[PDB]
Amino acid sequence: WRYGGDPPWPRVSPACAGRFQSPVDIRPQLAAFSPALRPLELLGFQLPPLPELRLRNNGHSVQLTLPPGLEMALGPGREYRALQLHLHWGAAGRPGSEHTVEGHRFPAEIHVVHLSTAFARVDEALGRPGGLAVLAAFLEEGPEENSAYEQLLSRLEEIAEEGSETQVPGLDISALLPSDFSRYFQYEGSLTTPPCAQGVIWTVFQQTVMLSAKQLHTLSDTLWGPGDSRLQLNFRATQPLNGRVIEASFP
Amino acid sequence: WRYGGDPPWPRVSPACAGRFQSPVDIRPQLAAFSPALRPLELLGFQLPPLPELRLRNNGHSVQLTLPPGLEMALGPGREYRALQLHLHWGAAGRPGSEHTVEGHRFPAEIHVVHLSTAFARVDEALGRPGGLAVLAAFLEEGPEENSAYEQLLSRLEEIAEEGSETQVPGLDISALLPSDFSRYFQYEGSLTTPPCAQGVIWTVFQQTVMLSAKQLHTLSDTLWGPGDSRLQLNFRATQPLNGRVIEASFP
Ligand SMILES: NS(=O)(=O)c1ccc2ccccc2c1
Ligand SMILES: NS(=O)(=O)c1ccc2ccccc2c1
Numbered sequence: 001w002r003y004g005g006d007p008p009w010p011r012v013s014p015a016c017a018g019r020f021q022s023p024v025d026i027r028p029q030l031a032a033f034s035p036a037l038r039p040l041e042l043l044g045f046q047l048p049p050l051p052e053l054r055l056r057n058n059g060h061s062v063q064l065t066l067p068p069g070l071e072m073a074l075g076p077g078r079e080y081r082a083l084q085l086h087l088h089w090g091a092a093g094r095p096g097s098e099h100t101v102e103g104h105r106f107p108a109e110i111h112v113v114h115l116s117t118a119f120a121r122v123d124e125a126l127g128r129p130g131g132l133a134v135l136a137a138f139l140e141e142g143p144e145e146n147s148a149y150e151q152l153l154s155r156l157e158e159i160a161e162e163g164s165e166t167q168v169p170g171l172d173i174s175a176l177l178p179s180d181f182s183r184y185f186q187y188e189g190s191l192t193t194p195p196c197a198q199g200v201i202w203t204v205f206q207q208t209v210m211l212s213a214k215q216l217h218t219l220s221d222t223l224w225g226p227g228d229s230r231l232q233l234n235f236r237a238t239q240p241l242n243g244r245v246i247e248a249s250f251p
Numbered sequence: 252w253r254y255g256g257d258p259p260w261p262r263v264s265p266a267c268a269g270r271f272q273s274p275v276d277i278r279p280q281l282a283a284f285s286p287a288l289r290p291l292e293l294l295g296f297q298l299p300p301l302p303e304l305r306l307r308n309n310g311h312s313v314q315l316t317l318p319p320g321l322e323m324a325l326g327p328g329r330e331y332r333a334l335q336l337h338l339h340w341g342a343a344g345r346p347g348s349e350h351t352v353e354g355h356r357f358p359a360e361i362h363v364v365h366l367s368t369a370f371a372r373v374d375e376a377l378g379r380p381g382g383l384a385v386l387a388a389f390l391e392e393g394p395e396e397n398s399a400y401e402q403l404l405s406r407l408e409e410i411a412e413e414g415s416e417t418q419v420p421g422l423d424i425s426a427l428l429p430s431d432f433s434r435y436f437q438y439e440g441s442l443t444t445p446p447c448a449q450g451v452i453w454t455v456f457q458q459t460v461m462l463s464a465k466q467l468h469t470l471s472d473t474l475w476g477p478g479d480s481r482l483q484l485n486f487r488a489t490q491p492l493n494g495r496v497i498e499a500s501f502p
């Protein structure tokens with residue numbers, strides 16, 4: 001499978017034709033304030049330099065495999081473990097976030113994918129209610145260099161080739177995410193690549209993360225994908241809410 | 252295990268000492284209004300007279316086995332099939348609801364137990380978040396005979412003995428539930444007997460159903476339980492929320 005070029009995605013996984021897919025356009029006006037949504041809690045995200053982490057150009061994103069030990073709670077009794085994180089971006093002058101706010105596409109987006117601590121494996125969690133949880137944050141142009149992101153961005157040149165990987169030192173994974181864990185959107189959706197299984201809880205931060213224009217250029221300009229093509233605009237088309245209500249942790 | 256007997260339920264099932272157990276005390280003024288909570292959808296609940304349904308004294312409750320085809324949705328794509336329903340009740344002038352409202356115990360309580368359509372079997376859903384969903388309604392004393400309940404209450408006579416069962420005509424299961432499907436409490440908890448599995452979504456109707464004094468007496472006074480005992484007071488004490496916020500579908 002590929003972005004903007006066959007095989008159709010439903011031919012690959014029937015679930016890519018589900019009614020309740022991601023990503024979506026968030027309209028803060030139409031979002032339901034629910035005071036039940038408490039601040040997110042992360043434990044174990046401040047990793048030491050060893051052991052090293054695998055960072056892979058899988059031809060559709062740059063993915064960092066996370067170690068055991070990273071615990072995330074959406075609430076009381078809603079407990080997850082982190083599996084991996086990856087990035088969606090655009091191209092020169094073209095934004096590449098997957099979610100949009102009131103139609104606005106941001107330059108890039110980070111996904112931290114988590115498994116419910118009721119399941120031992122992704123294959124058991126797929127399509128099950130709350131089986132997987134993704135933390136999502138927009139990346140926007142700022143005037144400073146983000147030093148958290150520099151640790152990963154400085155290594156992209158080593159994995160320029162499609163299907164290439166390198167080992168990188170552990171780092172504060174929570175420093176790749178906004179500082180505000182209390183203000184977010186939450187809805188139920190899908191994986192955004194085959195098999196596009198439903199039952200995924202998406203949590204989308206209101207606060208964005210700032211990278212420098214060069215950082216965003218390094219992200220969009222370094223990696224290569226299927227064929228002799230740049231790895232760029234690696235975002236799925238926005239999917240209709242189809243009657244789902246997006247909740248907001250804030251009024 | 253027995254009710255108000257021994258052993259200690261944590262000795263039978265250590266799961267019964269989990270942090271997120273049911274039932275709970277609902278305090279409506281501390282409930283969180285979430286507008287995302289939609290009206291419950293129940294299709295296929297209007298059963299014809301044939302085939303007949305199994306009604307069973309199991310020593311802990313009276314249990315009606317439900318056929319296939321009773322579909323329930325808590326939201327969009329969050330679907331369930333009804334498996335069975337059973338009751339909780341007190342004794343001569345003593346109430347026996349499981350859930351309580353600001354400390355008030357109601358005469359009796361109906362539980363309609365459903366299985367997520369993402370799971371083929373109950374044993375796969377046990378302990379998984381959203382695997383099971385229970386619809387709970389309070390039964391209160393009213394001036395009139397309830398004709399839906401009479402279909403069950405009039406058959407308790409011939410299953411008075413622990414482990415006896417009878418076949419009853421199909422009835423309209425939705426006629427046992429309250430008027431307004433848009434008005435309910437919701438939280439995540441447990442089975443209220445061993446094995447006390449967590450991940451059960453509890454929906455408690457705001458509105459009650461009314462039975463005659465005589466009907467409530469028939470419920471509390473007809474059935475025999477473990478040993479040469481009356482099957483009465485078959486409820487579990489209220490359990491601490493431990494940071495869980497109870498949600499309300501109405502302001
Ligand atoms: N881009 S995504 O929704 O965040 C995504 C899509 C497909 C996956 C398949 C397996 C594990 C994690 C996955 C994450
Ligand atoms: N009272 S309850 O929470 O509705 C309850 C208790 C024990 C069960 C055991 C097996 C299947 C369903 C069950 C439901």
Ligand SMILES: [Zn+2]
Binds near residue numbers: 086088111192
């Ligand atoms: Zn992604």
Ligand SMILES: [Zn+2]
Binds near residue numbers: 337339362443
């Ligand atoms: Zn029950």
